[PDB]
From a paper:
Translation initiation factor 2 (IF2) is involved in the early steps of bacterial protein synthesis. It promotes the stabilization of the initiator tRNA on the 30S initiation complex (IC) and triggers GTP hydrolysis upon ribosomal subunit joining. IF2 is also responsible for the fast subunit association and 70S IC formation, an event that is directly coupled to the activation of the IF2 GTPase. Here, we present the crystal structure of the eubacterial IF2 core as the individual apoprotein and in GTP-bound and GDP-bound forms.
Comparison of the GTP and GDP complexes of IF2 reveals several significant differences within the nucleotide-binding site. The largest conformational changes are observed for residues located around the γ-phosphate group. The Val82 side chain, which moves strongly upon nucleotide binding in order to comply with reasonable van der Waals distances to the γ-phosphate, rotates slightly between the GTP-bound and GDP-bound states. Upon GTP hydrolysis and phosphate release Lys86 releases its hydrogen bond to the GTP γ-phosphate and becomes available for interaction with His130. However, it is striking that the histidine adopts two nucleotide-dependent conformations. In the presence of GTP His130 is rotated away from the nucleotide, clearly in order to avoid uncontrolled GTP hydrolysis occurring; in the GDP-bound state Lys86 occupies the place of the GTP γ-phosphate and forms a hydrogen bond to His130. It is therefore likely that when activated by the 50S ribosomal subunit in the full ribosome context His130 adopts a conformation similar to that observed in the GDP complex, in which it is perfectly positioned to activate the water molecule located next to the γ-­phosphate.
Numbering used by the authors: 2 to 131, 138 to 355
Write the structure that this text describes.
Amino acid sequence: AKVRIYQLAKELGMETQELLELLDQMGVAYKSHASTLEEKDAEAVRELVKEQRGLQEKLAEEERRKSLPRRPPVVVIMGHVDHGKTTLLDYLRKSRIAEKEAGGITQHVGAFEVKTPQGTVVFIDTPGHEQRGAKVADIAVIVIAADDGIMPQTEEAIAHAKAAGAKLIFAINKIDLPQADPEKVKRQLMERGFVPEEYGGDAIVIPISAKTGQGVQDLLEMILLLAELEDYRADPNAEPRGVILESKLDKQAGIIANMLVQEGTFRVGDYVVAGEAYGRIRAMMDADGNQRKEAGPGSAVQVLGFQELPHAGDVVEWVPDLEAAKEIAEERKEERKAREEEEKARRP
Ligand SMILES: Nc1nc2c(ncn2[C@@H]2O[C@H](COP(=O)(O)OP(=O)(O)O)[C@@H](O)[C@H]2O)c(=O)[nH]1
Ligand SMILES: [Mg+2]
């Protein structure tokens, strides 16, 4: 029936003066908040309030989806042979679960994570050295032995990592050694125009012992700090996009591929295409051996269902159906072949 303004105001959990100015902008006349509202008007208020409150919750949804979730830094390790690359990766692999008994069951997916209080770091670990494959690492850790120092190979790796677009972090290794001269290496860096932060330059340089583990925990915090600065994010709802780390044959399983997920979320049953390779994702396994229904940005998973071995560095793309996967793969397969007469029938 006929509601009093203060009764409706309470009904909507609304402020007296708030409802009064609402009536004012609605063009509904009154005396005071004691005044009776008609049935039309009262319903118009309930309806207008519902819309205004609807839009406000809608409008705030678009705004917080504007902010994309954080993603972990993807780190690669480089530098001259014997400088400790493998030793560092091994210590890092034994770092994360360093107090646990097994389980895992631990499997090699092409990269592994280090869970740390300040955050999570992803380390590419794969055989082989340094077209090129689509961007993988955000950060390159350039390892330098303190008893040897910068070598032409070190300079090559520094150049490679910059060309690929990686941020550089210099790790001076083997500081445990008595013949180690960390300062000498620092001078070598500065001679080449890399000036350590302590001296007011932007070069990030940390002392480490891959044998001992000294500086390693500090190296991690530095990686995460540089990530905080760089502010890496990714959209888990974007069309799924990833990169092949490696492809492999297994006697029982057949063709298997490790991929790093970059954007979106891949799901079991998805059709994917990498280069000329396509397939349906049959299964996914993470570094902990667990089966995975979904893999989001930063996730490194072993994928089943590829029809051919993909190539390392090729972009894994999501496709709607099998038909699209085949057509997309075949146009690329035909591009390569047909164009190969162009490098043959022409100049050798
Ligand atoms: N003392 C000491 N030896 C190290 C350190 N890091 C690596 N090494 C040694 O360097 C040798 C080769 O290391 P490796 O990781 O295979 O070099 P890589 O080619 O860069 O991978 C091994 O015998 C390690 O024991 C370190 O921090 N301290
Ligand atoms: Mg080695």
